[PDB]
Write a structure and sequence with these properties.
The chain is of the alpha+beta class. It has a single domain, classed as Histidine kinase-like ATPase, C-terminal domain (Heat Shock Protein 90, 2-Layer Sandwich), CATH 3.30.565. It has five helices and eight strands; from the N terminus they run E-H-H-E-E-H-H-E-E-E-E-H-E. The chain has an eight-stranded mixed β-sheet, covered by helices on one side. The longest helix is centred in the N-terminal third of the chain and has 20 residues. The radius of gyration is 17 Å and the shape is globular. The structure holds ligand 8TO. Homodimer. Interacts with the co-chaperones AHA1, CDC37, CNS1, CPR6, CPR7, HCH1, SBA1, SSE1 and STI1. CNS1, CPR6, CPR7 and STI1. Interacts directly with the substrates GCN2, HAP1 and STE11. It is found in: Cytoplasm. This is ATP-dependent molecular chaperone HSP82. Belongs to the heat shock protein 90 family.
């Protein structure tokens, strides 16, 4: 089933750096998780210009945020390109990432955290509001996998026998810090999106559970 890989040294420093941080601008994680969604959607859209058969596994292009208050979990789904087992391992590295050293040094010097995106390590910004993450992904080239991290020195990758089938794409499952549950509220999620994710090519769905009036 499961399988452990160790994070490259500097990437651990970075996660540690982020998770033990104050900063009112924590909301920017959502900005970043939505960029990645858009970038992954861009890729599959483009990819299928030369290969229409490629969109077939999940026709519609969307981003969809689901709060799950019941279990202090916020999920950001896309129908983007997705990531294979190999891609999960190399890219949620394992492999040394260029902006990483460059950014922490940037941080120490006075840099704002929202810069994280401009250093190409934006994904790790999620640890501002989460201490567990599941990246479940399903790429056309491969089976659905779960990548898990608690922000330690190593992460796990399991074949996904457990959550639902993404036609294609990726769900970010965030297990939220107890002080950061505001990101489960509709009003709040709506506020962050409207301020940061203003210019986005794809639809942004928000799943909301109403008890019957
Ligand atoms: C949550 O998962 C995300 C990935 C986490 C990535 C980390 C580490 C991140 O902090 N920074 C990166 C960002 C932001 C990029 O935009 C980016 N794009 C290419 C830029 N250039 C170098 C070619 C890269 C390089 C590769 C990792 C890209 C990926 O593997 C080839 C894929 O192309 C797909 C599209 C992945 C996504 C962007 C996200 O997937 C979804 N579905 O959300 C980054 O490293």
């Amino acid at each position: 089933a499961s399988e452990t890989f160790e994070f490259q040294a500097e990437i651990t420093q970075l996660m540690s750096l982020i998770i033990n941080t104050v900063y009112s601008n924590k909301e920017i994680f959502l900005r970043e998780l939505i960029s990645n969604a858009s970038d992954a959607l861009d890729k599959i859209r483009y990819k299928s210009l030369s290969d229409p058969k490629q969109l077939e596994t999940e026709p519609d292009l969307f981003i969809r945020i689901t709060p799950k208050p019941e279990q202090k979990v916020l999920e950001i789904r896309d129908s983007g390109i997705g990531m294979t087992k190999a891609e999960l391992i190399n890219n949620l590295g394992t492999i040394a990432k260029s902006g990483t050293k460059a950014f922490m040094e940037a941080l120490s010097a006075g840099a704002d955290v929202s810069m994280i995106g401009q250093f190409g390590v934006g994904f790790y910004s999620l640890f501002l509001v989460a201490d567990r993450v599941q990246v479940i992904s399903k790429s056309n080239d491969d089976e659905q996998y779960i990548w898990e991290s608690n922000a330690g020195g190593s992460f796990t990758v399991t074949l996904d026998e457990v959550n639902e089938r993404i036609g294609r794409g990726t769900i970010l499952r965030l297990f939220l810090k107890d002080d950061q549950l505001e990101y489960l509220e509709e009003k709040r999620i709506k506020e962050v999106i409207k301020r940061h994710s203003e210019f986005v090519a794809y639809p942004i769905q928000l799943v909301v559970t109403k008890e019957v009036e």
